[PDB]
Amino acid sequence: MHVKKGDKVKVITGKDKGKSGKVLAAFPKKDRVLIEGINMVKKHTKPSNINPQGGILNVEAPIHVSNVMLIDPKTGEPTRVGYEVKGDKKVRVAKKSGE
Amino acid sequence: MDARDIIKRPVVTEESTSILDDKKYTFEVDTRATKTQVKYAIEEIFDVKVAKVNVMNYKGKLKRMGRYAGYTNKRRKAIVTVTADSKEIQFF
């Protein structure tokens, strides 16, 4: 996966195409990403110990990784990513000669 | 034989707690430990004076969760009674 937890994201396709957000979790076992404010769902949950009043809950749902491009940190555009050896560790370098 | 590996765990239930005040303690032991290994293991671990040991062997019950029929584990239960002039064991 080219996207990790804590990065900034621009969504490319889907019903919520064209917006931005910050990744909250990653599921590399199944190629899913959870981004705040994207792909909200309404869960009909019974009352229980969690959320004692129950009711309809409005929470995010995971989306596929391919629907996500990592925005350029300095300029602010989605871009493909490349790897360079800086120091003794591999860093991620954009296609606009950035980080 | 490394006494802490032939005494497994206490048995806590109404049947065991009812006799617990009779200075009788119920334990789980290995399926291979004998009546005297258990006695010396208890005396080594808890620093008591054992009077008797009784043992019994239990089969494995047959459970299921739908299409998956199997057997529970195999048990060996020991009731250890200590002498009158000896400190007790807690369990609590």
Binding site: - | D2, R4, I7, K8, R9, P10, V11, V12, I45, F91, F92
Partner: protein
């Protein structure tokens, strides 16, 4: 793991015995119902295994 290899192969068995007593106490408490940090059992088991492996490697 490397904190063991500098011990003089005799206090390592003291460590093993102390760990065995701790593990027996942990099973005791778990069976009674007074154990809340159940994650310590696996840690103690693996520490015992580590010490035994290092000792066996010591004698080749």
């Amino acid at each position: 793991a490397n904190d063991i290899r500098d011990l003089s192969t005799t206090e390592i068995q003291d460590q093993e015995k102390a760990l065995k007593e701790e593990l027996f106490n942990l099973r005791f408490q778990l069976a009674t119902g007074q154990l809340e940090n159940t994650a310590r059992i696996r840690e103690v088991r693996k520490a015992i295994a580590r010490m035994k492996t290092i000792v066996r490697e010591r004698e080749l």
